[PDB]
Amino acid sequence: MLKIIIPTTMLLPMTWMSKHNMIWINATVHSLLISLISLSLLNQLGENSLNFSLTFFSDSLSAPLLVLTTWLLPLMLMASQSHLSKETTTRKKLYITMLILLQLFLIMTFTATELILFYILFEATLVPTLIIITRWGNQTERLNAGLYFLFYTLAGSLPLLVALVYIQNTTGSLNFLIIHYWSHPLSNSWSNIFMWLACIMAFMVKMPLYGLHLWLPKAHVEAPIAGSMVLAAVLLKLGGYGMMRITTILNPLTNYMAYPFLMLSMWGMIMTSSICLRQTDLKSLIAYSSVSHMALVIVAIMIQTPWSFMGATALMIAHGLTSSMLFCLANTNYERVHSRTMILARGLQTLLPLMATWWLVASLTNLALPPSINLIGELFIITASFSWSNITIILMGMNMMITALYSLYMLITTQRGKYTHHINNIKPSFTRENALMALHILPLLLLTLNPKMILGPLY
Template identity: 65%
Template sequence: MLKILLPTIMLLPMTLLSPLKFIWTNATAHSLLIATLSLQWLTPTYYPHKNLTQWTGIDQISSPLLVLSCWLLPLMIMASQNHLYHEPPTRKRTFILSLITIQPFIILAFSSTELTLFYISFEATLIPTLILITRWGNQPERLSAGIYLLFYTLISSLPLLVAILYLYTQIGTLHLMMLNLTHPTLTNSWSNLLLSLALLTAFMVKAPLYGLHLWLPKAHVEAPIAGSMLLAALLLKLGGYGIMRFTTLTHPLSTNLYYPFLTLALWGALMTSSICLRQTDLKSLIAYSSVSHMGLVIAASMIQTHWSFSGAMILMISHGLTSSMLFCLANTNYERTHSRILLLTRGLQPLLPLMATWWLLANLTNMALPPTTNLMAELTIMIALFNWSMLTIILTGTATLLTASYTLFMLLMTQRGTLPNHITTIQNSNTREHLLMTLHILPLLLLILKPELISGIP
């Protein structure tokens, strides 16, 4: 654990002390080395906890997410270079520092075996994210987006703190290993129902569940590219991970809690897919599609079977890479046309033919076309939901149909059609962008060859 955490923390002094002309090269190269080193965590084992220290341990639920969070740091740094090109040196350093600061917190959140440490790192990721959105966002509305993000997350996670303290008074320990041994069997009394609800609320807002998702499109639209990638690929996954980790503590969940959350998640997948069909803003469209995909993750992790957990895990990893890639593509368009409105940035295929290939690949993975892990994830989740209740096939089937519709709509609007008159010259796509897209799509295509690495099943 420390051989990843310490180099990550040492990135901070390196960023401060690097000469300005080497700052991007150094930060990217070193974070890529850390990402490569973290791939060792993916080896599937039969042991419940690998790399176990007193406070952190890695098991099949956390290892894929940990590798994803290490993998995305160099990609976020690469994506932000053009965005920060004209900024003064101190702002560049501060930006990279705030990106690097999030990483140890996320690693601790995904690997902590102690609930207090989990809660602290879960909340600490909020501060650098808020700094990124409010300091480096594009529009003046970024302040209200930051306030939305802060208050939604804070208000929802206070019940989680109360629930953790209540668990401590009941059992006398908050260590996950001890909790698994003592198995706090919760009866259907009101206090236990409220405890389960409080445990779930914070993660449902973070995930986000439809109805509690209003902070997400605002935050995504106003955030700089690194902020969008971070939110879509990692911070939403904290919600899904929390549900998977904590619902097993309160096993089995009361049916009074199952039904509203499951219904809202599946209905939300349907509704947000419909909203995507009417979107005019490209980043907003991708943000709403995230809510739709995470709805499936929530629904799957509420059922608490091996199949559904496995499907939720694979979907979280696939969606993390896919949506991050889509945001990068939207950003390349925005940097050239300075507009996110679909009508004003259409028909770019003749001008940027290689970018059109990346658009096609990203959209096909978003639609869950074979042979991508997205397809495997959606099929696994659908089968788990269908076994639980046959009626869910109506909602999930319609949501999948709508996902295909809005993804094709996004592809056709950005790439095909007549070029708007105001676009006369456009900057060529460069090697950095192609490398960025390759590093997103390559894991997606390679993971299907050995999906047990991320399926959570040894």
């Protein structure tokens, strides 16, 4: 794992010692190179995970997440360098440094062998994200958003810290392999109930679970474009990865401790999808869509079947790509017209045709058109839920309809009709923006050909 990690660290002084006009070029080139090297973790043994050393290991659950992180960094650099043009050299280097530190923390968190190291890195991701949001955020509301993002997260994660140190005192280890091989059932007692809650609530608030989701519209809407990209594509998946890891010590209690979280996630799926139908802000709509998708992932993890875990992995990856693409698409128009309101600019297909094609493809993967991997994940989760109880189809069926509705609503409102007469500063699409969209989209389509790579450990 050292081969991936050291170069990422190297990226730091490479950008601090670069000429003022070459920072973006250098960072993008070597980020792409790092992504290529990482691509080699997808070779998986089968029966067990690849254990590089005592400290790091890679899984089939882990490999897809790492490749997505490393691939997301150059895209964030492409998306950032436009609105950061007026910035001083030192502040541009500081912004790139924040992004690099975030990538470094993320890679380590996914591959840490034991929970305490996972916890420390999973929490260290908070600092660069908060700095990005509050320092480079466009609006006044960013300060409030930063506080919401911090406090919601820490209120969940500190009980997890207490629970983890208690578990290592009683078991003797927090190493994930030892944790798995020496697993013993959790009795049904008040102590075990609160241990379960303390082990679960941090990852629940990271997802986010419905009702503990209020930080996400704030933080995802008030952040700069790269902040939003990394918040939706990767940082939401920390909760899913951590839950998939931690639920091995929680059996057989999960059988009934999962009921309220399943109820919240299914009904709130319906709720956030309906909310997307009456939204005046375009980033707000994409944020709530992310919430709806992660509710599906929460259900999949709580019901604890091989098909549900496979579907959850596929949906996490597909959501990460699609949501980042949608945020970038919204940001291009925002850059044009300097407002987030969805009905301000209309009929953009008449003015920007290729960007309208990108819009259509992103909207089609958001509603999970077959045979995209979005539908693969959603279908696997829906089947597992059907096995869990046949009545889930009603909720699942309803959600599919509302998602199609708001996806095509967004597409029709922004691209179709007639253009607003007054706005006359809509310039042709830049090569940078088109290439950013293609680099989001091509990987998703390519993934359909080889579905097993994003499927996970259960496969």
